[PDB]
């Protein structure tokens, strides 16, 4: 009943599969077949959603791509457990 | 919201583990909680992922838990390899 909910879920899935290389605004917008402005707004909402305390993945931006990464507050736990790293 | 950060820890852990996932014991061990506790938390995160706005699901296969994409979004993931 939220018109961009499936759009938002697709963006999450894409970034999830994209992995540590991530995806650019353009790449994301082309897959969804929406404008870049529309895509940005969706990405932003997802980024907001991830900022919630109960969420352990966040949507970061660097090197011209969006990508999913863990929150720094959780590192002590993740260290008890390859993987790919961003510091 | 007393288990929010715990659920966040589980999400973070499963996300980093990849497609090989983690058993209940590993999760319970990292969180330093009982297996029964870990299970309650894993199940709640599973319920959260089943909402339509989430693009990932949590599943149990071969006695491990893992995150994966929902297969209803497959046609967009094809459109990514291309």
């Amino acid at each position: 009943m939220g018109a961009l909910k499936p759009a938002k879920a697709i963006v999450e899935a894409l970034l999830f599969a994209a992995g540590d290389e991530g995806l650019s605004l353009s790449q994301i917008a082309a897959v969804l077949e929406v404008s870049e402005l529309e895509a940005k707004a969706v990405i932003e909402e997802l980024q907001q959603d991830c900022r919630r305390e109960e969420r352990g993945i966040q949507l970061v931006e660097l090197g011209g791509v969006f990508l999913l990464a863990t929150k720094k507050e959780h590192a002590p736990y993740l260290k008890k457990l390859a993987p790919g790293a961003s510091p | 919201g007393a288990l929010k950060p715990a659920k966040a820890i589980v999400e973070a852990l499963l996300f980093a583990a990849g497609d090989e996932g983690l058993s209940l014991s590993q999760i319970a061990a990292v969180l330093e909680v009982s297996e029964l506790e870990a299970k309650a938390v894993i199940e709640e995160l599973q319920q959260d992922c089943r909402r339509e706005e989430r693009g990932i699901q949590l599943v149990e296969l071969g006695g491990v838990f893992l995150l994966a994409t929902k297969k209803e979004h497959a046609p967009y993931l094809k459109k990514l390899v291309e």
Partner: peptide, 15 residues
């Protein structure tokens, strides 16, 4: 050194 973990790309597969 603030650690953020990423995960590798998924099953590129056929799709």
């Amino acid at each position: 050194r603030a650690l953020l973990f990423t995960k590798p790309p998924s099953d590129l597969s056929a799709y």
